[PDB]
Each structure stands twice: as structure tokens, then as C-alpha cells.
Amino acid sequence: MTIGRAKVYATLSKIFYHLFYDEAIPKDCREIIEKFGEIDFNLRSVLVRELRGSVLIKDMPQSLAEVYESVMKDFYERYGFQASELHADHIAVELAFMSKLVEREISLAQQMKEEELYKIRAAQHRFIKAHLQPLVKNLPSAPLLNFVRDFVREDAKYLY
């Protein structure tokens, strides 16, 4: 289960980072995602580069929109996470942040840090509700994007 969650987030993050670039998806990363049924990765960097919370969330008040990246960095710095070179609100970075949290969760499951385990899962849920899900609800329709949308949606249900 946790197995699991972390593998999917890391993979999804790497894929989007490749598409930004316009790297090809190692057929190993293909393999992981295609295990969930057949989908295609036929998206161009021109689109992908713009898949950022502050671009995609249309209802976003402009005053927030011009400080949203700074808001994202705050959440990251609080959890001892640090971005790649991409904008902090880029789907690839947000997805990467989640896999950090989920992988730290494994360690905590392995040890029996119950109290820290709850706190970490609460942080994951707060991040999804506030940032990642609003981002994914707003993706255009496409097989890979739909996959991310469903995955994040069910993960939010799971974490509650």
C-alpha cells in the first residue's frame, strides 16, 4: 500500500520532468505506469511547462497568484524539502514533494513512530487538499493527465 504510493509519485514526477525537456520516458518508467493499463505519454513541453498551480487554478485571486511560488517554497522549507530548478508550483515538483513525504512515511512505518506517522500523513493530506488536488482538478483531458487526476483523487480519500 505505502508500498506503493511512493513509487507512483516518484515515477509520475520523473515523467513530467522528462516531458518538460523534451526527454523521452525511459521505457522502465513507462513500464511502471503502463502496469495500470495502457496509456500514452504524447504531450509536448510547450504544454507541460505551463502545468503550474498558479497558471492552472483559474479561480485563483491574482494577489495570491503573484506570491504562490513563494507560498509553495514555504511549505517545502518547513519539511526539509528543496525543489529542482523548476517553478515550485510545477506539477513535477509538487509530485516530487509528495514522494519525499511518503518515503519518509515508510521509514516511520518500519520504525513504530505512530505519533510522527499521523503528523506526516496529516501534512500529506493538507498538501493535497490545498495545492496538488486543486492543480490536478484543472488539468486538460488526456490519458496521462487523467491518470494523475484519478491517482491524486483516490489518494486523498485514502489519507482521510
Side-chain angles (χ1 to χ4, degrees), residues 2 4-13 15-43 45-48 50-81 83-113 116-128 130-160:
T2 314
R5 300 183 45 252
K7 176 140 118 165
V8 176
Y9 279 109
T11 309
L12 284 186
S13 183
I15 291 162
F16 282 104
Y17 189 112
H18 285 311
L19 296 174
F20 194 99
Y21 272 126
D22 291 74
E23 279 152 44
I25 313 305
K27 87 163 90 208
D28 178 36
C29 270
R30 295 182 166 278
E31 285 192 4
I32 294 158
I33 294 304
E34 285 190 330
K35 277 183 259 206
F36 293 87
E38 306 184 11
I39 62 155
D40 79 66
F41 306 97
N42 184 27
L43 315 163
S45 44
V46 164
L47 169 84
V48 171
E50 296 309 308
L51 305 177
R52 311 210 274 124
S54 71
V55 167
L56 278 152
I57 305 159
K58 314 289 190 285
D59 273 3
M60 184 161 165
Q62 217 221 294
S63 319
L64 175 62
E66 60 208 5
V67 290
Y68 196 59
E69 187 160 355
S70 187
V71 159
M72 301 301 302
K73 282 181 278 180
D74 287 7
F75 206 117
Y76 300 161
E77 275 176 62
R78 197 195 165 180
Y79 289 94
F81 170 74
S84 58
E85 77 275 23
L86 309 189
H87 290 284
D89 65 338
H90 193 278
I91 189 170
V93 177
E94 298 194 6
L95 290 169
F97 175 62
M98 282 293 299
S99 79
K100 257 311 163 301
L101 285 192
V102 174
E103 85 187 46
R104 288 174 164 157
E105 179 180 346
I106 324 160
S107 189
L108 298 172
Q110 284 175 345
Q111 313 161 44
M112 288 134 70
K113 251 109 156 137
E116 288 102 300
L117 176 73
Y118 180 94
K119 286 199 277 196
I120 201 87
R121 296 198 168 126
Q124 293 177 23
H125 191 263
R126 179 172 37 102
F127 186 81
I128 298 198
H131 303 296
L132 187 61
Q133 187 167 57
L135 188 170
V136 310
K137 289 340 247 178
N138 288 291
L139 302 156
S141 183
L144 170 70
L145 305 172
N146 295 353
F147 172 90
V148 195
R149 199 190 285 107
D150 293 353
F151 175 73
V152 176
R153 192 182 56 251
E154 304 297 319
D155 209 48
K157 276 165 187 162
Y158 162 78
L159 284 163
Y160 204 125

